[PDB]
């Protein structure tokens, strides 16, 4: 046991030295040669009303028009962002939903929460009514986040510190991702759908592979539980949100933190983080009833959204970057552009 | 300017809004309370008796008493970090906290069960989300406590205790000790009650506590309180 611990410490020190050796120059020193981004003014266009409880999760469709949102009232609503019309209203058997996802093809929508069972709802049913298609059971903890890898397979994250890849046609977990010390809080799929990163309460983030099913690379640096995570549009980097009131950018090729976003007046945690289409701007939903915009290259507060009546819990940018939506515990969902 | 299908979609959206409003109005009538405590605290017996009067995850129990609908949620099986999902119950009406009274001298693999229960009660009551949520306390092991105190003294659990060995003084001391943990007496109150073989008494006490909480909420909603 002692020799194993000594070997682990030696490997950790070697990894630290290797990561430090690659830190030839910081992102700030390189990005200082370009002019800063001006004040970004985003005005609220549509106000999606209809929810009667706290908003906890939302996801944009591949068409950049439809979006699904989850609330503690137990009602999933698919909104038409261009007309503010509810496309569907799905009554959930368990109102304690905490995450939701929209399939890339737009034919299925998934959600989860304190029920420890991921419900897969079909929208293109011939019967004409949205009925639960599959119910993935097996998780010993609450579902923190879920994302559709493909129309056939789906990945889910539970509170038991282990993620599982479930096949829709089969219904049995094929790959089980283990290694997290803390409860995995959020997931984010890379553009190629080959690699995905996950944040846990142990302040670390780990890069996992789909086919291999092992921890490809681990990341650290946060002083608190990682609350949010999102892949950079290029697919070689990802930002992370945590309760210590700061965002940290990590690179999968450099294996270290690139830049840290923080401000003195900000002391509360972060709920959600999402990059824009080009990745030039970074949005992070803070607990102080508002969301701030950060310069991905200079860390300057390029701008801030007006704000909601309660904690901003979720947000997401369309696949075309035409607009960004922000959810809040005030039961309202606004789209900014 | 809306086309033939846009108007139909708007009408369908209005119908969905009406249905959602009706569901909210219907759901708002039922009371929402949270059940907490250890496994050996007797929560199972409470749930069983309440169901008679009327797998991993959280259990939701529905019952009605005196024309008042209740929704009880059990999160004991949720063996995960609570501070990351306990905030979901911010809008809960009350909290049912059960503690094993007779387990004062039992050991837990804090080392003592009563100390751990007090720590959990302090963490839940003084939580930032439950600043105004009332808590209902039940002692589901008073008979075992009476049967054991005659042989095993209470000083083993509370050395500082020096009162009489009778059951009345011990119960009063335990009640005072558990009540003193409420550091927010100005905004919230604790409803203590001793559970016994009789089951209707506990349901009536819960009903009275919920009625008081509903009165307080209604008085606050209209600006009076």
């Amino acid at each position: 046991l002692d020799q194993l611990r000594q070997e682990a410490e030696q490997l950790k020190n070697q990894i630290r030295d290797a990561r430090k050796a690659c830190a030839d120059a910081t992102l700030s020193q390189i990005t200082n040669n370009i002019d800063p981004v001006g004040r970004i003014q985003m005005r609220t266009r549509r106000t999606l009303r209809g929810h009667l409880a706290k908003i906890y999760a939302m996801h944009w469709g591949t068409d950049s028009r439809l979006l699904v949102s989850a609330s503690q009232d137990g009602k999933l609503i698919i909104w038409d962002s261009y007309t503010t019309n509810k496309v569907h209203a799905i009554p959930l058997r368990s109102s304690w939903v905490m995450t939701c996802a929209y399939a890339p093809s737009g034919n299925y929508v998934a959600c989860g929460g304190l029920d420890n069972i991921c419900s897969i709802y079909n929208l293109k049913t011939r019967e004409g009514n949205v009925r639960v298609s599959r119910e993935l059971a097996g998780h010993t903890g609450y579902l923190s986040c879920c994302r559709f890898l493909d129309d056939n397979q789906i990945v889910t994250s539970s509170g038991d510190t282990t993620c599982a890849l479930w096949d829709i046609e089969t219904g049995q977990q094929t790959t089980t991702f283990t290694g997290h010390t803390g409860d995995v809080m959020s997931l984010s799929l890379a553009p190629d759908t080959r690699l995905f990163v996950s944040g846990a309460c142990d302040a670390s983030a780990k890069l996992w592979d789909v086919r291999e099913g092992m921890c490809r690379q681990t990341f650290t640096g946060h002083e608190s539980d990682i609350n949010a995570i999102c892949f950079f549009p290029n697919g070689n980097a990802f930002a992370t949100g945590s309760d210590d009131a700061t965002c940290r950018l990590f690179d999968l090729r450099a294996d270290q933190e690139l830049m840290t976003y923080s401000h003195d007046n900000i002391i509360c945690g972060i709920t959600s983080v999402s990059f824009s289409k080009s990745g030039r701007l970074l949005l992070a939903g803070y607990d102080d009833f508002n969301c701030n915009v950060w310069d991905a290259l200079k860390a300057d507060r390029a701008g801030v959204l007006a704000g909601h009546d309660n904690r901003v819990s979720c947000l997401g940018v369309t696949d075309d970057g035409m607009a960004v939506a922000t959810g809040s515990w005030d039961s309202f969902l606004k789209i900014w552009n | 300017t809306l086309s033939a299908e846009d108007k139909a979609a708007v009408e369908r959206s209005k119908m969905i809004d009406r249905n959602l409003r009706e569901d909210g109005e219907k759901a708002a009538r039922e009371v929402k309370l949270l059940l907490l405590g250890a496994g050996e605290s007797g929560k199972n017996t409470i749930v069983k008796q309440m169901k008679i009067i009327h797998t991993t995850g959280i259990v939701e129990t529905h019952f009605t008493f005196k024309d008042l609908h209740f929704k009880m949620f059990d999160v004991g099986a949720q063996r995960s970090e609570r501070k990351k999902w306990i905030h979901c119950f911010e809008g809960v009406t009350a909290i049912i906290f059960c503690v094993a009274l007779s387990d004062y001298d039992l050991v837990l693999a804090e080392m003592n069960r009563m100390h751990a229960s007090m720590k959990l009660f302090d963490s839940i009551c003084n939580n930032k989300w439950f600043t105004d949520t009332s808590i209902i306390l039940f002692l589901n092991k008073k008979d075992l406590f009476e049967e054991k105190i005659k042989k095993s003294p209470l000083t083993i659990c509370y050395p500082e205790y020096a009162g009489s060995n009778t059951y009345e003084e011990a119960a009063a001391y335990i009640q005072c000790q558990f009540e003193d943990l409420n550091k927010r007496k100005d905004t919230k109150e604790i409803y203590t009650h001793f559970t016994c073989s009789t089951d209707t008494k506990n349901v009536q006490f819960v009903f009275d506590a919920v009625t008081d909480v509903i009165i307080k909420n209604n008085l606050k909603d209209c600006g009076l309180f």
Partner: single-chain antibody
Amino acid sequence: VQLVESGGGLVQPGGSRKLSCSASGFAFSSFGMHWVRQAPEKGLEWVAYISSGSGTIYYADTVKGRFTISRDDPKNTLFLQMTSLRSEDTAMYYCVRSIYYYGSSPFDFWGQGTTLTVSDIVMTQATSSVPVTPGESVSISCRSSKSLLHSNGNTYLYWFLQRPGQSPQLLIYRMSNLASGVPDRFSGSGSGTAFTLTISRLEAEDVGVYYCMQHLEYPLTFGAGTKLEL
């Protein structure tokens, strides 16, 4: 999904009849319902419509005020009360579903219809009968008096195929989305008012009449009906 229509037969001009269509196998409540008649050797014609929950009821000018359409969601039955029947009213009335939302496909299912006998945007089709052997591509041209393209950025055009002894079947809706279950051989396009339905390779199942329909104005109209046969 199944629609069973009841009522009809020989009726007198001044008589009355109450058609009853029993719906089952789907969410009758959420779906809309239309009545479309088809006289012998004549194209389809829209009669009436009821929106979800009976919130909006529309009638055609040819039957406005004479016919009375009602809906019963709890029982899931569609009734059409006709107090007066002219000679031209003899036709088979088909019940059709219609649900309206982004990405929907209205008029996707058509009932078997019932035979009843008595004792606006204009849609035109260039060619009516185009004898062509199976395998060769076919093209059906269509023209509308008013531009069906709405400011929202989509065109409200529908194509229906009615085979001998079978109700019409939705091929393509909104001119750009292929209906579910229809082979990919069918393709449709247009520009403002000139629409064209192209078929890669004609087969035996394609034998039938193709009916074009516009959905820009609620007073729907159907074309003459292009018939294809080997």
